[PDB]
Design a protein around this ligand. Sequence first.
Ligand code: A1AI0
Ligand code: A1AI0
Lengths: 230, 216
Amino acid sequence: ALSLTADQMVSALLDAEPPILYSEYDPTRPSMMGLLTNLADRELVHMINWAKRVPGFVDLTLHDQVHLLESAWLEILMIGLVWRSMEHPGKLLFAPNLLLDRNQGKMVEIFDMLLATSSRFRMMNLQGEEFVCLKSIILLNSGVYTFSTLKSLEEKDHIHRVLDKITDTLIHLMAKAGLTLQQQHQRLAQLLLILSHIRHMSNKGMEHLYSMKSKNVVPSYDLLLEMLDA
Amino acid sequence: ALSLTADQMVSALLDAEPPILYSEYSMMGLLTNLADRELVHMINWAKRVPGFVDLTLHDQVHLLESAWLEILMIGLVWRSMEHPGKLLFAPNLLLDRNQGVEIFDMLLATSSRFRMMNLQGEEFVCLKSIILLNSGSTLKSLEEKDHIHRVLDKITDTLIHLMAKAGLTLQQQHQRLAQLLLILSHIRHMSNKGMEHLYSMVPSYDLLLEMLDAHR
Ligand SMILES: Oc1cccc(CN(CC2(c3ccccc3F)CCCC2)c2ccc(OC3CN(CCCF)C3)cc2)c1Cl
Ligand SMILES: Oc1cccc(CN(CC2(c3ccccc3F)CCCC2)c2ccc(OC3CN(CCCF)C3)cc2)c1Cl
């Protein structure tokens, strides 16, 4: 996995991309949290099958894969939602049959930040290749500071090696788009600064799910491990 | 601001660095007091961060209201970098995790990360100014937002310049840049958990405006 070229690492991420799902509702009938809850639960399954295809991820122990998924899953859903919404200014495309504006999201604070992130992606003309690299970064980075045995330290070192390889891959893509060296690292910095906004949005979202104090509203270690299908 | 060279960028950030404060010569009360004194120094530091005073007072208050704990936290991690397993809130206030916890360990993990990257002082002050500018639709706000993104790009150039001066290769340059900037997601994370804890017991917009809205 540390041996793949930048072109190969991109093609692997593009072929691993999960599908866009539809919301589960009756369109002949006149409950939003339940609809979004249900949609997120079903997206989560496809995310985990995507993560398994992220080069270097299945080199980790199953325990460490679950930990990274635990820390990252909501950021990963959110960046996909924001990517999906780039072409629909003012609205969030949770699903092709569930395009919502901010007055329906009424809570609204996170909705507004997702819309802002979608705008910035849009006016940056974020490319498909770049977006799948950013998803990989979130998966590996979000849990890397919340793991200290010997083995864990080897696992952290491997995660940092793969993150360096994703960085190289992103720069390769900007180089191939014709950007100058200065423009390459300026764009790389802009894209990583947005990931900290996405982390903030995920933090507020997780804060809301934990305040529900409801057993099956935060994916458990066992639920994620089951979806990983050892 | 937009005219400064990379070297003048670093010199201004270094010139503007606030002092390390001491604790008085019961724990949460001493930490609250030390943080209250640091906040005052951080306002005048922020006024000296290129691009910042070009902003409206209202935008400056919003940026500090959003970033203040992150900035406090990155300063604490920096101060603790050379003291494995301890948080140096002040030279006379060195705590270990037993005296706290979840937040403490995250802070200790960031400190350990700085150690492994051999984080440099000139790098530290660029990262702290990125936190201020980044963490937080009238024509003027659009004009502010565009200005902030421009200053952020020059700090990126300044960071690259520092690594290039040291002798790092370009591959090592973009790799280290990404490593430094991804740490910022974790500092946002810890700030949000810290806000959560403090509300379970924070400087108001008016307090911030009062300190920032100085006379001549
Ligand atoms: O791609 C998406 C598709 C569908 C929704 C979403 C994001 N959402 C909606 C929002 C939200 C509300 C409250 C808390 C956090 C949140 F983000 C964020 C913006 C509007 C309100 C959401 C809601 C509930 C969620 O909780 C599941 C996990 N389920 C439980 C886990 C058991 F497996 C309940 C997961 C996400 C994405 Cl990013
Ligand atoms: O450099 C530092 C110097 C002194 C303390 C700190 C950070 N802290 C201590 C810790 C903490 C962090 C996050 C949340 C709660 C917390 F306990 C850090 C890990 C364990 C305890 C802290 C304590 C009280 C606080 O209360 C404000 C509101 N007050 C400001 C309102 C004035 F109007 C002070 C502000 C931060 C830094 Cl990073």
